[PDB]
Amino acid sequence: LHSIISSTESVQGSTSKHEFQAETKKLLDIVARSLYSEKEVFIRELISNASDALEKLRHKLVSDGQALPEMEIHLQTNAEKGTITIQDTGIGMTQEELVSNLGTIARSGSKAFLDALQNQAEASSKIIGQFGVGFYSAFMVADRVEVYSRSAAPGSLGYQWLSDGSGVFEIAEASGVRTGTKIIIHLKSDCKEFSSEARVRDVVTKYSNFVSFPLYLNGRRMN
Ligand SMILES: Nc1nc(Cl)c2nc(O)n(Cc3cc4c(cc3Br)OCO4)c2n1
């Protein structure tokens, strides 16, 4: 087996509170309404985000003149805790990105995204991914979301990022965060199926061969 996901992180700083941008909750809601009928697609959304993070790390390392490290995407299920977790070893998120990325669309203007979603020229799931709000689909299956991220940028600290998706998120420095991003989803009462290894395998195997870097489920290679 080849696993990297474990409960290694430790809170080692006090908590900073951040309120959602005014429109962010509206956009969270519209993603959830759009994707409910195929709610399992959140896994593909987060794998796509992880792949994007690995590509960003690739280009950093190409310009740095350095080797490619273990560049992987890992899924973990925990039926006892009612969680699904995804961890990538990609570029990770800086403090500034953890503060600002959720509200990017709200701040820059949602018109283009909402127009695209309305026109339905492609699958809603694809549009949502393309506009960079695939992470919004984490919330639609979660009672709460628990994120650990550390940027590959020099001097970057590791952070815990928590939210129940309602209107606030909280950031605290953490020790033991691997470069990249880990997202722990505490699943909603109607979404417990995604804490089943068999169910997640069934869902992901339909597209796992389309993933460029090694993809693992509970330590087992999927591609
Ligand atoms: N996996 C991976 N990796 C990197 Cl580098 C990412 N950069 C990103 O913006 N995302 C999606 C994302 C992750 C978040 C967040 C907001 C957003 Br929009 O707040 C808490 O964590 C990323 N997701």
UniProtKB/Swiss-Prot annotation:
One of its GO terms (cellular component) is mitochondrial inner membrane. Keywords: Acetylation, ATP-binding, Chaperone, Membrane, Mitochondrion, Mitochondrion inner membrane, Nucleotide-binding, Phosphoprotein, Transit peptide. The keyword Phosphoprotein applies. Found in skeletal muscle, liver, heart, brain, kidney, pancreas, lung, placenta and bladder. Expression is highly reduced in bladder cancer and renal cell carcinoma specimens compared to healthy tissues, but it is increased in other type of tumors. The modification Phosphoserine is found at S100, S124. GO terms for biological process: chaperone-mediated protein folding; negative regulation of cellular respiration; negative regulation of intrinsic apoptotic signaling pathway in response to hydrogen peroxide; negative regulation of reactive oxygen species biosynthetic process; protein folding; translational attenuation. ATP binds at N49, D88, N101, F135. The modification N6-acetyllysine is found at K192. GO terms for molecular function: ATP binding; ATP hydrolysis activity; ATP-dependent protein folding chaperone; protein kinase binding; RNA binding; tumor necrosis factor receptor binding; unfolded protein binding. The keyword Transferase does not apply. The modification Phosphothreonine is found at T104. It is found in: Mitochondrion; Mitochondrion inner membrane; Mitochondrion matrix. Chaperone that expresses an ATPase activity. Involved in maintaining mitochondrial function and polarization, downstream of PINK1 and mitochondrial complex I. Is a negative regulator of mitochondrial respiration able to modulate the balance between oxidative phosphorylation and aerobic glycolysis. The impact of TRAP1 on mitochondrial respiration is probably mediated by modulation of mitochondrial SRC and inhibition of SDHA. Belongs to the heat shock protein 90 family. Binds to the intracellular domain of tumor necrosis factor type 1 receptor. Binds to RB1. Interacts with SRC. Interacts with SDHA. This is Heat shock protein 75 kDa, mitochondrial. It comes from Homo sapiens (Human). The lineage of its organism: Eukaryota, Metazoa, Chordata, Craniata, Vertebrata. The gene is TRAP1. The chain holds residues 71 to 293 of 704 of the full protein.
